[PDB]
Amino acid sequence: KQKNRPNRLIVDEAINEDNSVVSLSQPKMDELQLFRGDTVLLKGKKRREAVCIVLSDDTCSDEKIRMNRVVRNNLRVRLGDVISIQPCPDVKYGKRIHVLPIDDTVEGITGNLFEVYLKPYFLEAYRPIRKGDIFLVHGGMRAVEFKVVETDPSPYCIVAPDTVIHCEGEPIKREDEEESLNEVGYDDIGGCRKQLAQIKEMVELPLRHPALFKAIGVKPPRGILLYGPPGTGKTLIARAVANETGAFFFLI
């Protein structure tokens, strides 16, 4: 590994007022394979995750990250702790997004919350979110928080202009935010790392490396046999090495 797990970062105050924007430094994004318009997967305390877009900053420190009070409260952390950043280069657009406001933020106001709050907040914005993000929407001389309920890309997605926004009546309240349904990943795969690393290599080298197999001349993993007792996460492994790599799965 490397020194002190260098994806660990210090939370700091930001300059941008955007909720879904966190700030890094120039050689940090180059070392972490990050672009100026790409999306990441932030992870923090209390097993709470976040999806954000890393933008370039000049006043940001080398080993710190600048973010506002929304992601700090979403990660359930205060000023002075440590957070981690993971790259998320395989995000797909969303199809249906359910949002429900908190009860104290809509007391005194009535009507449709889509055309006033949700439509200007996502008008060609492409802000990425996860399941359980409470994001602050400004409008009507007030500040109303809106919480993600359920998306059809269930772990993580980007709000497309074709995404139907669901803001039906009788919303839920602030709760323990229990998890009930998700899509699999490498963390969903259990203890197989002595062979998971091998098959990770034999599928990662096919990923975005056409000329590398020309340098070999032949492609080494032509056919892969995965054998064991019936039910050892087999289609879980096959589905896991597909979505995070980024491909078409098409199981038969």
Q: Does position 212 bind other proteins by CB under 8 A? A: yes
- Shortest Cβ distance from residue 236 to ligand ADP (Å)? 5
Residue 115 is given by DSSP the state I
Beta carbons within 10 angstroms of residue 180's beta carbon: 7
Binding interface with ligand ADP (CB under 6 A): 190, 230-236
Q: Does position 207 bind other proteins by CB under 8 A? A: no
- Cα 12 to Cα 61: distance, rounded to the nearest angstrom: 9
- Cα 12 to Cα 14: distance, rounded to the nearest angstrom: 6
State yes or no: 232 annotated in a binding site: yes
Nearer Cβ to ligand ADP (9/203):
203
Binding test (CB under 8 A) with other proteins, winner from 194, 208, 230, 252: 208
- Cα 201 to Cα 224: distance, rounded to the nearest angstrom: 12
Residue 244 is given by DSSP the state T
Amino acid at 167: C
* Residue 205 touches which of ligand ADP, other proteins, none (Cβ within 5-8 Å per kind): other proteins
Give start and end residues of each alpha helix (H) in the chain.
26-31, 69-74, 119-121, 193-204, 210-216, 234-243
Q: Does position 224 bind other proteins by CB under 8 A? A: no
State yes or no: 219 annotated in a binding site: no
Select from 156-164, 171-179, 209-217, 240-248 the region that touches other proteins (CB under 8 A). Answer: 209-217
Please report, as ranges, the residues that interact with other proteins according to CB under 8 A. Answer: 201, 205, 208-209, 211-212, 214-218, 220
